[PDB]
Amino acid sequence: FIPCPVDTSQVILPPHLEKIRDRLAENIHELWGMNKIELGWTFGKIRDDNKRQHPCLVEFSKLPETEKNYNLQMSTETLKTLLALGCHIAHVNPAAEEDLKKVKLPKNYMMSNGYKPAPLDLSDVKLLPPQEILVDKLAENAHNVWAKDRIKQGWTYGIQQDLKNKRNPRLVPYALLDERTKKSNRDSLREAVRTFVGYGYNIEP
Ligand SMILES: Nc1ncnc2c1ncn2[C@@H]1O[C@H](COP(=O)(O)OP(=O)(O)CP(=O)(O)O)[C@@H](O)[C@H]1O
Ligand SMILES: O=C1CN(/N=C/c2ncc(-c3ccc(Br)cc3)o2)C(=O)N1
C-alpha cells in the first residue's frame, strides 16, 4: 500500500494560528474522549483493554508527551493542508470565541479521575456543500498521513490487530476501508472545520 497525502512541505504556520491549532487539538480529543466513553471505555493508569482501561482518558493537558505531541502535530498538518489546498484562514469575529458553549455531557460522562469531556456545542453550525466536499477530502487525506506515519514507524497490514509487532488491518486505501471507519473520520474533521468557523475563523479558497 502506498499512501501519499497533500505535500505540506513548503507551507509555514503563522504564529497567530498556533492557538486555533491548539484549541482544535483539545476539542478533537474531547470528541474522541466522548465517543470512547460511549464505546465502554473508562480511565486507568495502565493500558488494560479487557478492563476498558486507557491512560489517555484524562484531559488533553495530562496526556503523555509521545502521545500528546502527535495530536498537536496532526492538528498542525491539517491546518497546513488547508493552506496547501489554497484556502485562506482568516478571522471573522473574536467574540465568537467567547460566545462558545460546551455540551451538557450527562453525569455518566464523568470518569474516575475527574475527566469528563466537554466538546464545543456546535450543533448550531451548518456547512455549505463546498464545505462538505472539502471535509470529505480532508478526512481522506487525514487517513493517508496516519497510514504513512505508521508505515514510517514500521507498521504493516494484518488480518487481525497486534499492538506489539506493529500490524493493523485499517492500513488500507481509503476506498478499501470499511464505511464505519470512514464515517467516524469524516465526522471528526467535520467538527474540525466547525471549530474554525465556531471560533470565528473563515475558510475560502
Ligand atoms: N481518530 C482519532 N481522532 C482524534 N484523536 C485520536 C484518534 N485516534 C487516536 N487519537 C488520539 O490518540 C490518543 C489515544 O491513543 P491511541 O492512539 O492508542 O487511540 P486508540 O487506542 O483508540 C486506537 P484503536 O482504535 O486501535 O484502539 C488520544 O489522545 C486521541 O486523542
Ligand atoms: O484510519 C485511521 C485514521 N486514524 N486517525 C489517526 C488520528 N490520531 C490522531 C488524529 C488527529 C486528527 C486530527 C487532529 Br486536529 C488531531 C489528531 O488522527 C486512525 O487511527 N485510523
From Swiss-Prot:
It is found in: Sarcoplasmic reticulum membrane. Brain, skeletal muscle, placenta and possibly liver and kidney. In brain, highest levels are found in the cerebellum, hippocampus, caudate nucleus and amygdala, with lower levels in the corpus callosum, substantia nigra and thalamus. Sequence repeats lie at residues 1-105, 106-205. The calcium release channel activity resides in the C-terminal region while the remaining part of the protein resides in the cytoplasm. Belongs to the ryanodine receptor (TC 1.A.3.1) family. RYR3 subfamily. Cytosolic calcium-activated calcium channel that mediates the release of Ca(2+) from the sarcoplasmic reticulum into the cytoplasm in muscle and thereby plays a role in triggering muscle contraction. May regulate Ca(2+) release by other calcium channels. Calcium channel that mediates Ca(2+)-induced Ca(2+) release from the endoplasmic reticulum in non-muscle cells. Contributes to cellular calcium ion homeostasis. Plays a role in cellular calcium signaling. It is linked to Congenital myopathy 20: An autosomal recessive neuromuscular disorder characterized by variable manifestations. Some patients have congenital limb or distal contractures manifesting soon after birth, while others develop muscle weakness with difficulty running and climbing stairs in early childhood. Additional features may include facial dysmorphism, and delayed development with intellectual disability. Skeletal muscle biopsy may show variation in fiber size with type 1 fiber predominance and atrophy, hypertrophic type 2 fibers, and abundant nemaline bodies. Homotetramer. Heterotetramer with RYR2. Interacts with CALM. Interacts with FKBP1A. Interacts with SELENON. This is Ryanodine receptor 3. The chain holds residues 849 to 1053 of 4870 of the full protein.
